[model samples]
Target: AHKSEVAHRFKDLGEENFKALVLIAFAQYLQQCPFEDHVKLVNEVTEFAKTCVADESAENCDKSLHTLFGDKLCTVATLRETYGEMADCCAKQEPERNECFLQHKDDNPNLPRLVRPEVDVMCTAFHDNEETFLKKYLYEIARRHPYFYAPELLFFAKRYKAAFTECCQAADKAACLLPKLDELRDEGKASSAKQRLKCASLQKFGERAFKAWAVARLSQRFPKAEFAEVSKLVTDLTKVHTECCHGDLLECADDRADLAKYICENQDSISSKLKECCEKPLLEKSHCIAEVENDEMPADLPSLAADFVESKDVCKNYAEAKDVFLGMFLYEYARRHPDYSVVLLLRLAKTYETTLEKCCAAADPHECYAKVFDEFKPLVEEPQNLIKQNCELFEQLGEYKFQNALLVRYTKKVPQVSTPTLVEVSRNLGKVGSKCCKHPEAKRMPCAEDYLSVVLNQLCVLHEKTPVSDRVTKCCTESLVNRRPCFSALEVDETYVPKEFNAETFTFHADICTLSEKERQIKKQTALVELVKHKPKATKEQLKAVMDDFAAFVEKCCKADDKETCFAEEGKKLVAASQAALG
Candidate 1:
């Protein structure tokens, strides 16, 4: 009786529609079937499926319907709130029921955010009255709001639209649609936190975000210390800033000085909770220095890069040496690349300025300067020789190093450009290099080897060619200097971890060495995928297994100091196994 009623219920539907109903019922039963019984139940359904479909065979029916229904057959969470409610209302052909569903559809949370209430009602009305009209409504909705769909979801709709147009001018539209839509997704991901969080309602949220950022910054400074304990200290420090500092804490240029002053003055009287949270016992005397004036150590002050190279013993003798070194290097570089712009020369100067600030320290001025000079001297002294000798520096430093060498040579030889122009050019180059070099797009390309040769060729070409606007002039003339040194003077070496507190003992460099190192691992993963795809007649299961192994291999091997070699060695084994697998 039950089976006869089920057959009768779907009798009004067409051949394909009846088969779909049977498949949905079968899917529900299969969800509960034990693995061992799956084959038996599947065989039993063969006759029932054959009666509904025009096709003689039920063999492909199960897989075909499984693909079509997908999650809808097994779970109704996604459709329950809107689609299911509308379907139920329209099931019995009641006008009042259809209107009620439409009334409540807007209040339904399951409806997509971008799909306005009116659009939902119109789409649902079309879906109930005519199936053909429903398809058209969905197509227009997707075309109008591509961003509403995930990248992969919208990609299919675009491909569908393009398929018909591919014969002539239309062919270009479908092919271009994938990348153009993909670019929107990429741009959304790249939008900065500041841009996302600058609204009035989100102003307090910035303080919360800043608290987390402060703790993260402090964690890098004190890697071995417990984060929970340091978090407490930062929490207190933030409190002190809010209550004691009578200025805009983050906005003011002298904020750092204000922070130091408040901490120093209130060190003895601050709550016991803060005192207990300090990483060191003498945190008051150490960080809250009594001697360094607030004016001398303003927040926005660019570090005197010369201080690191100048000798403390020779009455600021290092200052003279610093200038001499920079001048000689810049003038020499300028002479070597005679046609190079004043802008490129300034960029080199800025790079050197950054390198000095990072590697050299005022605490151990002599040793730090010696190390920096050793690292820089090869490129500065003989660019042609250095380019041939060190591939590492050439790959990383590129044209900036070459420009600096020329700038050093040029300043000493002869100066055609004005001092102001030279200064402006240097600043602009530095800013552009810093922004572009760190860009994700830049990491995808091969690093240039012969920096000087390439730039020299470009310079000669540019000299004869027409030029663009004066963005560089704005870069050079800006006197409100805001560039900070990449390295910390107080940071110490990994091996010489300090056991006690003293201003002189801090001899570490900031976290600057391995910038964008993850790009190599990302490249390796992509390479592994290409290698697996190269395997002939590989099964889905086989490819998936090898890919999983490759992921684990990358997680372990790509983190090594010699990651390039590690990935190469491991990748070879995984690719071979992938080629051998049949199941």
Candidate 2:
């Protein structure tokens, strides 16, 4: 549906007509009806749907009709209520719609029982009547209520008269939903328990949608664990928010304090779940947190060891009480459970890294993680192998060795490491590093090359950590090598192409005569087609014309008068993505 609000001809129609009109219009447009027909059909079905509000008996009657009409009537659960009654109506009143409508219905307990033959009968009628009876019929009802279809419906009809000039598909309508959800979250949708519920719902929808899309994209590239955590997060946030608050969904922010505890508690579980589900391409699971509290630790917080590091005086000295508690909890866990997965351990390491950067960003940008990295670069370049001489227990010696190497790394990297605060940071880094090296998942990551690779690569850039260790690096290198290979084939390289596939078949399969060439083409085509489909042929041209027309845009944006500014922006993104592939 377009999601454009319908002007209600009747003031009483209010949001109900607004919602239903889009559905009606969508049905007409999809059926290739004229604009007038679309409006009339929407108006009629919308008015008939209103009959449901007359009473419970009326509602059930309308529900039955909705099932009978199906897409012709533009009836879906989001548009109507009592799906159970509607489905029942399909079998008894409209059997054709019943069979067809069954596919469109989401799983709802309120729908009529499938065991009854009446449901099928009504459904069939609905499917049969979809075009002539439902579509045009709905508008007939609207025409009767002139007052209902007057100002709102008339105004909407006129506005939509020009819709052909701007018509786009359902996918185009759905594209902005994710970003809007993100905006809702940024605006504090999850502040209170009630808000958390609302925010959670919003995030859940986006999370689920994104995860499904991402799984479709990444299933081939990642381990089940990879998708599992992402899927679990979507499931958990969606369920908790929607069920409790009945609010819209949003995207999760990195610094959502309320969600922090959930992250802590389910980090391992989600990680494991993602791995388990994606192996056989299982349906993504929905998840729930035991409880939600801002800045409160979950009772089931993983007891694995994690070290904390900070850049600013505030974080370094425990000025931010939240970080202190989190750090303490992480430290306590690592100290207690010496044996834990490296992937989880590495996550803990980055948490500390980010916490440290936050502290530094609070104190001064000079102390930020980037600055810390810059300061430490000379030492990293020198690269010393430091083995701890401590004998806490020889069996546990491996853990300490990793920790000590991390400690040495920071001390030499950060010039300010001579201080007591730096000493604590160094010690904690060592502990985290020790824990990470012992983790099995960390070893599985292709990028886990050395201490520097493990700490900076996995922890600093969560996404860049992949089973294909150097995908990003190789991608970036290829981009530079190919002199910026436009957008589609920017990262074609030997590293990205699987060793199982020949280079020519992987990158340019047209020359290959083998049967496997078809499979390689399928893989290559996915990446190429996605890029082209998203960035259409005229998109660049349209963007250029738009920039040229907007004088203010050019004046405000241009670095120089002759130079163009505000291009399609994808070129830069592709370049950056290529760079990160290398990083």
Candidate 3:
């Protein structure tokens, strides 16, 4: 008489409660058909369920129950060891019977794990109904737990259905599903792993930071998403994370279990790419659907603007949760302007906060906040150009010379900054280019720009507290949104003269000639940086002439009769020519 959903829940009840629910259901059924022997049938079924619940074996119990009730009984564990003697709890009348069952509601101690049906036997149960076999499965899992909430059972039920569907269709069913049993158990365990991570984040960072982290993480995991789409995905994911992370073990268990059901059914609506995932076998569909990214970003994407800043609740929301508020704004801006660097995004967020603070000076708060998006338009232009120019260097100069170029440029721009600071800045910035510039062409610019902004931001922080020339301090003092471009446009420090060159930094050996072209190129570029470092006044023409002659000298000396002796003399002579040529 019960629906499959209702039947699923009934599987988790304790023995006394299991009997209690059986009598309750049959009581309603007798009224519908008026079986005069309803009282007689109730006793028979009560003892039958009790016998199955108590006995080590469910086979014979299934035989009697199947003939007696057919599908009418709806659920049976065809499934646990607890010490309690619960037989008396089912005998009490009406409300007392319910209370009696609840009092003894504890499950069996040391429950056994469910063994999946044999491959041959599976077809019969599966053929009965796709979902019906899952009802039997429900009994198996529930019987093993001390107790379980109704909501937690569905995910496993779906897993069961998926397992049956796949394995049963294959030519060699056992081989197909031999290892599925482990996956089923592992997935159940894996579900808790996600809980601990999120709950711990919420506990550690609090909801504001947690939301910020989550939305940012989602935007990161799906870079090309529209602001609108990613926001909704976060909203949907957050719905459960908030509750689950709040620390109700079973309720969290309950919501997470239910979330699996909801996500699997609705995933395709989030992105067409999810259709492929949702189409995965039902069990894995949830896990496959667990996380997905768009293969290609949409073509006609709109400009991302956060109207939330202009909301009447702007200050209220911002005040209630600062990181989360700004974080959401950041997520919106980042996804829409996927081209913006991460540093730029962070700065954009900081500026939005400051802009809102400016609103406090006005009678109408939104007046100051209304133009926040417009304010960043000009702010983004130059840094993006700088990113393109930096990548041009990164692509052309490659890593070695790019680092050298970065070092020389920063050295000239903020010439009095410490050597350690320059070295750290150059190395870190080089990694950003190495990490991002070599990515696919479509992502290279955004990756380079965002990462570039991050490194530049690091330079600002390093210089912000440390002493340097007035120009370094001047640019570091600029607003977050404008700081990078300020440095980008800073005039080179002509007043700061570099130390004169020393040829000892160069080592010339026959080994240089034996090296690969790339290896040889590195040696040449290293010499180039040393020259530029010591002779900051050298023109591009003079530098080129020096490299052209140096390239010729290495070829000439590497093959000379003296070999090592020839390199030592010729390498020194080339440096002299560069000096004399420049002088």
Candidate 4:
């Protein structure tokens, strides 16, 4: 008796088709809910469908489907012919309606809509030969069922385009979909309707845990501003943490505490910027944060010190004081220079390992040391000066591992040189180890004057090494300016006349180190041109302004010759500022 008129009309459309139509209609209705709440509704409706199917009485299915569709469940053939038009009229906007009708007009317009059974068969067919259907008939299906499964299918197509470009480069196309979809599903899960808004807010601001803390703490501070001011300030704090702490904002035990303390201390200053951003429209305020970029953003980010329980002493074996010194130096240096690429650092570490294995642990350490020093004599500067001196010191000082440990601590903790200069200094110390530790008077080695000379000598070596053509190419690759001192060093090397001292020619090769200051500036200009060209929506005037601003951004944010190391950390800020300038 319930919904008898609707039940009687759709009797011709088979049981499965009728059920599919009901489910699609229900899913479409559920799509209207808030995006974050879609997961619950979809699961609820899915459960309801399961319950209906589980009921043994086929009569219960008909009653539920007919009741749910109601007047929409007209005669099967009539419903098929006009459902596309019906869905068009039922569309959320005119653009969607126009698209639906246009697609219907272009397709086999006389055919009835296939309902759920038709979509199932078609989706299976399309999944098998996706390329052909996607290229040819998918648009027709999209227009037919614009608000249903069509959107997800189209989204998958766009993702596949990006994936095919990235993951399938020079590889087989057939095997690509499986791996690509695996990645796509993972990425999509976060941005799907159920999770989209939550993920967007987290990405836009920062970590959710910290934001939740802020909301709880700052709820009443700016009640008049509708908490917009507080929200803006909290976002700024998170931005600072994300940029400075490398996304370890909330997890690091001390970083959150430090940020909280800063907020408490600088509330007045933070509030002014908060009000500035809050008063503007939401979009403009977001855009403004990058424009008025703060210079005094926090830098002392807490490290995951828990991981450093006991240092992996890669130099536990060798006995000669010099060998032990060199080994310990490298082991300690690697700990401090974790920012360096693993491959480059590991290659250097392996080189030391190979050298020690060949020479340090031999039957007669002295004979092996002398032979190895002879082999490397021409490669390094004045090895003979250190060879005899190193042996005599080792004879007197067997292994100065205790003092070496103290020196290693000094380099990492105090006389802090955690920079490229530090890397240069560490290598030079190995070369000068014998000279520093030779005299018994030098018992407390690296006395104040020794520290100054070692550091100065290393800086001078870096100055000379910088002139090599390969260094020029590397500097250019990293968007750095050429140095005048480096060129002078190359000139001196080219002029030298020596006997067994055959250094590599490229260090002084004229063709490679020929870039003039004008050419260097032109290169930076070209890079800016190429970067701006990618963003076609950006205007010429805005591009010109951003280029100048980026030049200033680089100067303000980065240091000379440190571009290659610091670019990823500092370049993001420059990119954001340029984006702000563009809009």
The model with the greatest TM-score is 3
Give lDDT: candidate 1, residue 184: 43
Per-residue lDDT of candidate 4, residues 1-583 (tens digit) = 2333224323423343333333333323322223223334334434444554455243444443323333232222333443545443433343343334323332223335524234334445455765554433333333333232322434455565565455334355435545565555533332232222223335544475345433323332322223344556557666654543321111221343344444545546443345454444321333333334222222342332211112222223333343333333333333333222222223343444566566545575444443332332342222233334544554564333222222232232222222234333433343345344553431222121233233443343454455433533332222101221232123212221222211231011122124654344334433432343334345547655765665565464344553443344555565667656654
Residue-by-residue lDDT tens digits, candidate 3, 1-583: 1222222333444444444334333432222222233334555666555555555255445342223343332222110122133435434454454334334433343435556667778767787765446544554454443233333345565666777788888998887775686556644543433343346546654555454544655565565555566666666667667764543333444465555566556544344466676555432443455556433444675554434754577788877867667766887666555455555666667778788767855788877677777877776775656666777889888786687677767666665766666766776677677777666554665565545455655565566667666777776655433556677678877886786656577667888888975567556545555666677777767766876897798889877676787787777787688789877
After superposition, the stretches of candidate 2 with alpha carbons farther than 4 Å from their true spots are: 1-25, 28-31, 59-583
How far off is residue 545 in model 2, in Å? 27
Q: Answer with 2 or 4, whichever has the higher lDDT.
A: 4
User: What TM-score does each of the candidates earn?
Assistant: 0.20, 0.23, 0.47, 0.18
Model 1, residue 423: C-alpha shift (Å): 46
Point out where model 4 deviates above 4 Å: 1-156, 165-171, 174-176, 193-297, 300-583
Compute the lDDT of residue 111 as modeled in candidate 3. Answer: 39
lDDT of 1 at 549: 78
- Could you tell which candidate, 3 or 4, scores higher by TM-score? 3
Question: What ranking of all candidate models by TM-score puts the best one first?
Answer: 3, 2, 1, 4
Quote the lDDT for 429 in model 3: 76
**Judged by TM-score relative to the true structure, which candidate is superior, 1 or 2?**
2
Inter-residue clash pairs, candidate 4? 80-113
Query: RMSD to the native, candidate 1?
Result: 28.9
Least accurate 10 contiguous residues by lDDT in model 4: 501-510
Superposed by TM-score, candidate 4 places the C-alpha of residue 165 at a distance from the truth, in angstroms, of 4.9
lDDT of 1 by residue, 1-583 (tens): 1233223323433333333333323322222223223323333443554453443343444333323223222233333442444335433333343234323322113323434234334334544654334324333333232222122222343443343234223335435444444444333322211122222112443454344333433332332334344455457655544432222111221333445444545544322223332432221233323222212111242323344345454224424566444443443333333222333343455556566555455566456555454444443333333323333333465644433322322222223323333333333333334333442331211112112223222332233343322322232223211111111011212222212222222111112124344344333333332332233234446645765775576576646575565555665665456545632
